[PDB]
Design a protein around this ligand. Structure first.
Ligand SMILES: N[C@@H](CC(=O)O)C(=O)O
Ligand SMILES: N[C@@H](CC(=O)O)C(=O)O
Ligand SMILES: N[C@@H](CC(=O)O)C(=O)O
Ligand SMILES: N[C@@H](CC(=O)O)C(=O)O
Lengths: 308, 310, 313, 317
């Protein structure tokens, strides 16, 4: 009866992998679980080269006939970045479910145990296939493309204000609500098998008195892309625009996102750079880095931003 | 009979295709108040700068000192209204209403929001019950505190929200409904005296994200910044590279303030990390309070206390 | 060639003044004529609080007929905000077409300063005429948002941004004259729905009873005595029932009335609980639950079949 | 000196015990969070032990009188009330109107039973005790503390059937939050409550009867008749939109008013303002939801049946 699920641990407040498994032995009634310790770091230290390797490992795991799904334990701070990277790069319809905890395993009313039990339920459910990469936490199933950590510190921090959840887990039952209307996983062009490094992309904030010199510094340190976390709908001050023009003059791809938290940065013929659609800055950086593995053609990169 | 309101125009999409053109388009405002328009500036708010917001604050302070001004409405772009409004929230030494207003659609647009926004803002500014509430941002039938309200969406009419703090009030059916008073210091109780000042200590904002680079901290230090606000991962969590950058800044006397990129909530104290914490201030609000904090002191404990009280 | 869109008007504040015919709404936003070849048809002209099942049934049947024509590519239905979620979910279950069906409404009357209706209607016509809008289920378009009829609800008495689906989000948004589609609903609707209402002229009676401290058994008695076929309970919490409500429900079940337990809370799942009477409404709110229950009772009174509809529609 | 906090237990899922991790007395709640001893000197008192869907006005009245008695004592600094989540908003708003003290009254609840994996009640209870015992918490009105949030009784509502984060005040936010063992107070409510409320229920043992009727397509007039015949003193209408009323509902309302029943138009929508409309029967609920509006109406009817006086209470409380 039971699905074969690998729990691949990377670190996080949620935390070895076998302690997490033995600490929530109820997972063993939902799936035949095998723990693998991939890494053990706080997610604020997760790096692209490690995420690239995580993607390659999960691709290897899901190519096996004896693996039905993977649960990846991770820190909450950057789970949206790791999850979106896998969303673009894992070429399987078998479920990939990131899980995390906002309270440490030792805290009163720690959320990790239930989050993990939910994540294993989701990863093992046959109805979970072909949905894109998911983040499960606090009874919710979020798409990697939409979900984001919206609050510094609360248990219900992961939300997608405009897109909602793919599903919810209540009373030990999964309720699937939406399928994302975007490309991912088995329909994505972002194959990264045997890449070993990724194009450098920095994120610069927009705000009153924002300085041009941060652009100059990024250019000088060899960035290939800049994601702008812009005022409003990717609006730019005279200083930012001077900086973006310098970047473009020097061969950098400029992507205008928003610092607001939500919503669409629309095309604008009268401003430099590309536009991020509804990708926030963290997600935009991940798609831009992957885009630059394939192309430097701004029309092609822009169309990825509208479709992924 | 009527309240005397000054409409001080700074620019923004609310005036997008003069202040008297905005007034003449909403002649209904004249039944709520005796309005006078003044054109302070005309710029998109992405170009608003501290030096200009200083002048704005000084002008509004001057106006509110006058018997013949009951309140001020400030028309502004949406993109950085939260920054301008929080600056005035900290520096305007009057209990008379100061109401920032804006529009997400240009004045020419089908179902443009500016006309009703402006009428609501004039109602709020003239209402006797509006006194002593701190600076306000009025848009889309909502009254937001300058300390909590933020532009949460790039493009929608209902973008201004304070998810955890709610609205001070709402305007429905031509009546104001006051819900909350902010439990923070502001306006007449503020220490932030900016009379005589013409510029402000330099503070930049650096983002937190996977692979964030140390060299941006170096660049900021080299350019003479007095403060760095960090728009951190999670609860102001810092990578190894960020910590290195922050330790370099602290050694050079830069005040480092850890906020969050998430959008909401509390960055709690953590003695094992560098720098101060931003309480519930988002990075744009944190920059504004940190610049004003540095007009009084560089002492980290004093600044941290401002951050827990303003 | 522009899409051919019928604008079917039913009333609402969108046509209110401080009433207006469909051609006036159209002519107040002449931009709609650049997006589509529009034909206005006045179906009704009432406030939506007065919209009734028998009329919604006729609306559905008319829209079904229209969308079977080769010269109609989609329909926009102007309606009051107050019960648009009920009309829209009814059509979502009963219109057997993939062509777009887009309800639109306005929170401010047409005469109001910064009236919302003009942009709402333009957006609605854009949505209805886009080929990418096909096969999505019935939609409610307002305030730059495209809500599924199955999830969207009026969440605020009085604001422009009242239509939200907190847990399910929007199907799409309309920004800068462009449609951004985000989600497809994972539920049955329209061309995959079993709820055929061709030929019908009336629907089984279903009332909604509220749950709250001191809630009285006598409202159950009254509904039962008046011949209701179903009772939707707008329950405390997750369809929780007081001793009085349980007494009332057991009376109803004795008389063959189908009891459906929803929630007054506004959102989320009422889970199965074999210890309590009645069926459970999944994530359907009470207004939506009533619409699905009325239609279910046209086909079955088997509680298991009804329960499965509530988990799949 | 630590504050003296009474934990007054009334039931709820916070005190629930299921078969497995996928009824309880107060001292069991207290003993599962021994950390509470460092925040306060706590004493447990068992007021009731029921599911909150069974809480009744007559018992809520007794609860308020007990809390009033407790807070009059010098040796009581604050009270925490453990309760079911389903009608906590009703009991809390009742006390918010009738507790004549500035000392903290903090309702607390839990969405998962005590036996559940990652049960929320232990931390909810600790946070409620911290809030009740903090000197900064006085004079804030009655509070509901759950999931790191401090909600005013006047605004807070259960918005979701089943999630941990269900308690929200979408338009009014939280009074405060509790993060890292520290309280952050954000707002003071701009409404009358507690020591400034006219609603004294010291002598009473019951309240005027008020029922709630829903608004929806095809809503039936006969439920108005039924209510009137069962002796209601008020009807709260959970109306369509902004308290909009069908022709059937208007006929029902008019019959109610003829019989001296006070009709209060609220909204089913979940949030926002039901504005005055002289063209419609009855009064309007301001931003009070139906459950809150019923509580205020019952208390209003202990003092007056003057619709003007009742309307003004609804704009001020
Ligand atoms: N800093 C932690 C926070 C968490 O997991 O809640 C991490 O991201 O590893
Ligand atoms: N970029 C404009 C946007 C607006 O006002 O909606 C501004 O901030 O001036
Ligand atoms: N009562 C009106 C309100 C609206 O349309 O906004 C209706 O539903 O017809
Ligand atoms: N039905 C329970 C639900 C809860 O406590 O969460 C009660 O309200 O007592």
């Amino acid at each position: 009866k039971l699905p074969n699920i690998v729990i691949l641990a990377t670190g996080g407040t949620i935390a070895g992998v076998d302690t997490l498994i033995n600490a929530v032995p109820e997972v063993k009634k939902l799936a035949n679980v095998k723990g693998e310790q991939f890494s053990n770091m706080a997610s604020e230290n997760m790096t692209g080269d490690v995420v690239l390797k995580l993607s390659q490992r999960v691709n290897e795991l899901l190519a096996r006939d004896d693996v039905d799904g993977v649960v990846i334990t991770h820190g909450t701070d950057t789970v949206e970045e790791s999850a979106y990277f896998l969303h673009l790069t894992v070429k399987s319809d078998k479920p990939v479910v990131f899980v995390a905890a906002m309270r440490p395993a030792t805290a009163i009313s720690a959320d990790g145990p239930m989050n993990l039990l939910e994540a294993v339920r989701v990863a093992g459910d046959k109805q979970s296939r072909g949905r894109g990469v998911m983040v499960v936490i606090n009874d919710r199933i979020g798409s990697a493309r939409y979900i984001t950590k919206t609050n510094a510190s609360t248990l219900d921090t992961f939300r997608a204000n405009e897109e909602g959840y793919l599903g919810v887990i209540i009373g030990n039952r999964i309720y699937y609500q939406n399928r994302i209307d975007k490309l991912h996983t088995t329909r994505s062009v972002f194959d990264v098998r045997g890449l070993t490094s990724l194009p450098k992309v920095d994120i610069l904030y927009g705000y009153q008195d924002d300085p041009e010199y941060l652009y100059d510094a990024a250019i000088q340190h060899g960035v290939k892309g800049i994601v702008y976390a812009g005022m409003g709908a990717g609006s730019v001050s005279v200083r930012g625009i001077a900086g973006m023009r310098k970047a473009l003059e020097k061969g950098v791809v400029v992507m205008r996102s928003t610092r607001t938290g939500n919503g669409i940065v629309p095309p604008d013929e009268e401003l430099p750079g590309l536009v991020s659609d509804s990708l926030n800055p963290a997600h935009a950086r991940i798609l831009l880095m992957l885009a630059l593995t394939r192309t430097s053609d701004p029309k092609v990169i822009q169309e990825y931003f509208h479709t992924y």
